Design a protein around this motif. Structure first.
Motif, short mmCIF file in Angstrom:
data_model
loop_
_atom_site.label_atom_id
_atom_site.label_comp_id
_atom_site.label_asym_id
_atom_site.label_seq_id
_atom_site.Cartn_x
_atom_site.Cartn_y
_atom_site.Cartn_z
N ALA A 25 0.81 -1.22 0.00
CA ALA A 25 0.00 0.00 0.00
C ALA A 25 0.85 1.29 0.00
O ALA A 25 1.82 1.40 0.74
N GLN A 26 0.37 2.17 -0.88
CA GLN A 26 0.90 3.56 -0.99
C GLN A 26 -0.17 4.53 -0.49
O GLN A 26 0.21 5.63 0.01
N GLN A 27 -1.43 4.23 -0.59
CA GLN A 27 -2.55 5.03 -0.12
C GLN A 27 -3.63 4.10 0.45
O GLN A 27 -3.82 3.04 -0.14
N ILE A 28 -4.30 4.51 1.50
CA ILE A 28 -5.38 3.76 2.13
C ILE A 28 -6.44 4.78 2.57
O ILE A 28 -6.04 5.89 2.97
N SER A 29 -7.72 4.47 2.52
CA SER A 29 -8.78 5.40 2.86
C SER A 29 -8.88 5.40 4.36
O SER A 29 -8.33 4.52 5.07
N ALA A 30 -9.63 6.35 4.88
CA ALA A 30 -9.78 6.47 6.32
C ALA A 30 -10.20 5.22 7.05
O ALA A 30 -9.78 5.06 8.18
N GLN A 31 -11.09 4.39 6.48
CA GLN A 31 -11.53 3.17 7.22
C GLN A 31 -10.38 2.33 7.66
O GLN A 31 -10.30 1.74 8.76
N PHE A 32 -9.39 2.18 6.79
CA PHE A 32 -8.19 1.41 7.01
C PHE A 32 -7.23 2.15 7.96
O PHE A 32 -6.60 1.51 8.82
N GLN A 33 -7.16 3.45 7.81
CA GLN A 33 -6.28 4.23 8.72
C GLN A 33 -6.82 4.08 10.14
O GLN A 33 -5.97 4.07 11.03
N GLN A 34 -8.11 4.01 10.33
CA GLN A 34 -8.66 3.92 11.69
C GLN A 34 -8.57 2.55 12.30
O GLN A 34 -8.55 2.47 13.53
N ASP A 35 -8.45 1.49 11.51
CA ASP A 35 -8.42 0.13 12.08
C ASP A 35 -7.05 -0.33 12.43
O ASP A 35 -6.42 -0.70 11.41
N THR A 36 -6.63 -0.35 13.65
CA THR A 36 -5.29 -0.86 13.94
C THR A 36 -5.29 -2.38 14.20
O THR A 36 -4.20 -2.82 14.58
N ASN A 37 -6.37 -3.01 13.95
CA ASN A 37 -6.50 -4.44 14.20
C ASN A 37 -5.93 -5.29 13.04
O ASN A 37 -5.56 -6.43 13.28
N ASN A 38 -5.92 -4.75 11.83
CA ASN A 38 -5.39 -5.50 10.72
C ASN A 38 -4.29 -4.63 10.05
O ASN A 38 -4.28 -3.40 10.17
N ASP A 39 -3.44 -5.40 9.38
CA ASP A 39 -2.29 -4.89 8.63
C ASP A 39 -2.50 -5.14 7.11
O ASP A 39 -1.49 -5.04 6.36
N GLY A 40 -3.73 -5.38 6.71
CA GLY A 40 -4.02 -5.62 5.27
C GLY A 40 -4.97 -6.85 5.13
O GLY A 40 -5.53 -7.34 6.10
N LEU A 41 -5.14 -7.23 3.86
CA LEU A 41 -6.06 -8.26 3.48
C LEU A 41 -5.41 -9.36 2.68
O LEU A 41 -4.50 -9.06 1.94
N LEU A 42 -5.89 -10.57 2.85
CA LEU A 42 -5.42 -11.72 2.01
C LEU A 42 -6.71 -12.14 1.26
O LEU A 42 -7.63 -12.69 1.88
N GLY A 43 -6.78 -11.93 -0.04
CA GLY A 43 -7.96 -12.24 -0.82
C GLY A 43 -7.97 -13.76 -1.17
O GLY A 43 -6.97 -14.37 -1.60
N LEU A 44 -9.16 -14.33 -1.04
CA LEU A 44 -9.42 -15.75 -1.36
C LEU A 44 -10.59 -15.95 -2.36
O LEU A 44 -11.05 -17.10 -2.50
N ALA A 45 -11.01 -14.94 -3.07
CA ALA A 45 -11.98 -15.05 -4.14
C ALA A 45 -11.21 -15.57 -5.37
O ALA A 45 -10.01 -15.89 -5.24
N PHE A 46 -11.83 -15.69 -6.53
CA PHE A 46 -11.13 -16.22 -7.73
C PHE A 46 -10.16 -15.17 -8.28
O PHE A 46 -10.46 -13.98 -8.16
N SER A 47 -9.04 -15.64 -8.82
CA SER A 47 -8.00 -14.73 -9.28
C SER A 47 -8.48 -13.83 -10.44
O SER A 47 -7.80 -12.80 -10.65
N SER A 48 -9.52 -14.19 -11.11
CA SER A 48 -10.05 -13.40 -12.23
C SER A 48 -10.35 -11.95 -11.85
O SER A 48 -10.44 -11.09 -12.76
#
Ligand SMILES: COC(=O)[C@H](Cc1ccccc1)OP(=O)(O)[C@H](CC(C)C)NC(=O)[C@H](C)NC(=O)[C@H](C)NC(=O)OCc1ccccc1
Ligand SMILES: *[C@H]1O[C@H](CO)[C@@H](O)[C@H](O)[C@@H]1O
Ligand SMILES: *[C@@H]1OC[C@H](O)[C@H](O)[C@H]1O
Length: 323
Positions: free
Chosen positions: A105-128
């Motif tokens: 990440a180079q930019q993140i919206s406020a929702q992410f700036q406010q959450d100190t519980n996670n350090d990002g996301l690991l996506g498990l939907a289809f790669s498409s």
């Protein structure tokens, strides 16, 4: 053949589930999301004030940059993130993906700036639906799938207790009875399935389609279904301060079930009490509107009741009641 178990843990009120992931030697706490296909992490390329309170990835230490590659993602709640891409080694519950694309990440919206519980996301939907440009990348699961004993993962999310992500095998001790499978439509990149019917307490109605999404907190249904449900909850009212319908915390809520290829998946009324609305003294319901999008989001409220198998062969989803 590989297999592994990663332990997830809910944050307050089970708002999200985080699991440790080791990227190039550093462990980060990520939210595993079956509704998206990007693995993005807080990084040293963010402003220092935004790095505060998180474990961050430093691409320079170990990543191999994909010159000219970018990513940009927008989610259903309006949050967004963007940045650049590196390849590195990613380990989840002892299964290592080498050369996995890691979206720094180079930019993140406020929702992410406010959450100190996670350090990002690991996506498990289809790669498409991976957002990497100019060439999309594969999800951690697609990257390792061929090395696994079976090309599947399973999830048990729980209410205020640690749960698991099983990769490459099914843990029969996690559910009661046998699994029931249903076909998956992956044409929009989601784990989408059909339900034949639903029962909201005393009322039943016809079917619809929805996606199995660990990255969504609630059970998001058509406004028609939401109305029908809350019509049976004494004193339920909408509170925009809380985020949707609220009710007195001592209320007896009706159960909600769906019929999926012959199997009735039931969410007990006690699980539909999400928690304190934080708007005085009421509680927020676990069922809320999907905002007219045309399909339902089977989020954590629903998943807390089931052991779910995400099988790439079919593809298909298997369900059984959690033990
Ligand atoms: C492009 O597809 C997505 O964005 C997919 C699928 C989706 C499509 C359309 C609508 C909703 C969901 O979402 P997802 O990837 O699961 C994506 C990941 C998060 C980490 C941004 N979740 C969402 O956008 C949903 C609506 N967001 C949530 O559930 C947020 C995290 N939680 C949240 O809203 O908690 C409910 C709450 C309300 C009021 C007070 C306390 C709690
Ligand atoms: C998952 O399955 C693999 C392959 O069977 C085992 O080696 C691993 O120890 C775990 O049980
Ligand atoms: C998380 O990791 C591995 C095990 O399944 C254990 O249950 C847990 O704490």
């Amino acid at each position: 053949a590989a297999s592994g178990v990663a332990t997830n843990t809910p944050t307050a009120n089970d708002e999200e589930y985080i699991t440790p992931v080791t990227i190039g030697g550093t462990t980060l706490n990520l939210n595993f999301d079956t509704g998206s296909a990007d693995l993005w992490v807080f990084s040293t390329e963010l402003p220092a004030s935004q790095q505060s309170g998180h474990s961050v990835y430093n691409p320079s230490a170990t990543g191999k940059e994909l010159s000219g590659y970018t990513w940009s993602i927008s989610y259903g709640d309006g949050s967004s993130a963007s940045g650049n891409v590196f390849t590195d080694s990613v380990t989840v519950g002892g299964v290592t993906a080498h050369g996995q694309a890691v979206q720094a990440a180079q930019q993140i919206s406020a929702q992410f700036q406010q959450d100190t519980n996670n350090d990002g996301l690991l996506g498990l939907a289809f790669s498409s639906i991976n957002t990497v440009q100019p060439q999309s990348q594969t999800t951690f699961f697609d990257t390792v799938k061929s090395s696994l004993a079976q090309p599947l993962f399973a999830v048990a999310l729980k209410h205020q207790q640690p749960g698991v992500y099983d990769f490459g095998f099914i843990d029969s001790s996690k559910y009661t009875g046998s699994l029931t499978y249903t076909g998956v439509d992956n044409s929009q990149g989601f784990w989408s399935f059909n339900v034949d019917s639903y029962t909201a307490g005393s009322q039943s109605g016809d079917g619809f389609s929805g996606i199995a999404d660990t990255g969504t907190t609630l059970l998001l249904l058509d406004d028609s279904v939401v109305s029908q449900y809350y019509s049976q909850v004494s004193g339920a009212q909408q509170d925009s301060n809380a985020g949707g319908y609220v009710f007195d915390c001592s209320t007896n809520l009706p159960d909600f079930s769906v019929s999926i290829s012959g199997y009735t998946a039931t969410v007990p009324g006690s699980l539909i009490n999400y928690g304190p609305s934080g708007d005085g003294s009421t509680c927020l319901g676990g069922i809320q509107s999907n905002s007219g999008i045309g399909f339902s989001i089977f989020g954590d409220i629903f998943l807390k009741s089931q052991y779910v198998v995400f099988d790439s062969d079919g593809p298909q989803l298997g369900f059984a009641p959690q033990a």
